[PDB]
């Protein structure tokens, strides 16, 4: 079984890099993020070629990297989509977990 990596992982495909900590995400099944592809949970980097490798932030296809991290209504919850549900009606948590600036994702 693949093991979770160390905390402090940088996601740095873009000029707005974000740190991923697995320890804060333990309530989440591995395969909700490392989702099935062709019937098997895929643990490759999300922007691997053929995966979310389209760096146009307007793209909404299954290759759009921005889309996979930010949008609602996706087949697997995105960073922002899950965080919106987590924050609920709490505006402080909305700023912390979903704010586009001054949040725990983006300074």
The footprint of ligand HEM (CB under 6 A) covers: 2-5, 9, 11-18, 20-22, 24-25, 27-28, 30, 32-35, 37, 42-48, 50-52, 55, 57, 62, 66, 68-70, 74-80, 82-83, 86, 93, 97-100, 103-106
Tokens representing residue 102 in the block: 């001054």
CB of 93 to ligand HEM, least distance (A): 6
Give dist(CA 82, CA 37) in Å, integer: 20
Q: Is 98 exposed, middle or buried (0-12, 13-18, 19+ CB in 10 A)?
A: buried
106 is in an annotated binding site: yes
Other beta carbons within 10 Å of 78? 19
CB of 47 to ligand HEM, least distance (A): 6
Q: Which of 68, 65, 62 is closest to 80 using CA atoms?
A: 68
Residues annotated in a binding site: 22, 25, 30, 33-35, 46, 51-52, 70, 79, 82-83, 100, 105-106
């Amino acid at each position: 079984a693949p093991k979770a990596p160390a905390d402090g992982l940088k996601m740095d495909k873009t000029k707005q890099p974000v740190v991923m900590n697995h320890s804060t995400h333990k309530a989440v099944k591995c395969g909700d993020c490392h989702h099935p592809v062709n019937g098997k949970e895929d643990y490759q980097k999300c922007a691997t070629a053929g995966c979310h490798d389209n760096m146009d932030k307007k793209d909404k296809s299954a290759k759009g990297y921005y889309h996979a991290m930010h949008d609602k209504g996706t087949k697997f919850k995105s960073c922002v989509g899950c965080h919106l549900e987590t924050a609920g009606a709490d505006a402080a948590k909305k700023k912390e977990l979903t704010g586009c600036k001054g949040s725990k994702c983006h300074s």
